[PDB]
């Protein structure tokens, strides 16, 4: 029950990984979803792969 502005995330140019699967990252603002789940953590670098 909240609008997701993915342009703020995608065009931030601060995130070191932008990996989208099944959905193009430029069309996240054009499709919409029943729910989205967010999991936020800190992990090492050789392991974000």
């Amino acid at each position, epitope marked *: 029950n909240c609008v997701a502005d993915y342009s703020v995330l995608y065009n931030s140019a601060s995130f070191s990984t*932008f990996k989208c699967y099944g959905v193009s990252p430029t069309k996240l603002n054009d499709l919409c979803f029943t729910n989205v789940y967010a999991d936020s953590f800190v992990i090492r670098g050789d392991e974000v792969r």
Partner: nanobody, 127 residues
Framework: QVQLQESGGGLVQPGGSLRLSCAAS????????IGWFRQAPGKEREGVSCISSSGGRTNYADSVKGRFTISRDNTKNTVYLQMNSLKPEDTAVYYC????????????????????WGQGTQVTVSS
């Protein structure tokens, strides 16, 4: 199966020249923008040079103006970086990274996410 592979690293004399290669397998490198990045011993990974997908836009770090020349071959799926007048300050491991523009505007001067990375190659400048 997407791979980025650097080549051409080695040991050179200061004032000499060296030439690196970055080749892509499993995907077509022409649509991606490619940038060459190095980390010096005890330093953070700085942006050496970048080139657009079509090659019409380029950017270089001020330390390397007039010395390094970047270019690409979209038919051969490779991006090249020529180094001339090489200095001990440039001793570092060199990565090639491929990504897409995350901001409006043609130029590649800004930094952003880098989708794919190589394993890096070593160029040492010492004499």
């Amino acid at each position: 199966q997407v791979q980025l592979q650097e080549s051409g690293g080695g040991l050179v004399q200061p004032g000499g020249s060296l030439r690196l290669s970055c080749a892509a397998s499993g995907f077509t490198l022409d649509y991606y923008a490619i940038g060459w990045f190095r980390q010096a011993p005890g330093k953070e990974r700085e942006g050496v040079s970048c080139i657009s997908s079509s090659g019409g836009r380029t950017n270089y770090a001020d330390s390397v103006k007039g010395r390094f020349t970047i270019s690409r071959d979209n038919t051969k799926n490779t991006v090249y970086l020529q180094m001339n007048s090489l200095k001990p300050e440039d001793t570092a491991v060199y990565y090639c990274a491929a990504w897409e523009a995350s901001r409006w505007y043609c130029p590649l001067q800004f930094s952003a996410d880098f989708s794919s990375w190589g394993q890096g190659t070593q160029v040492t400048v010492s004499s």
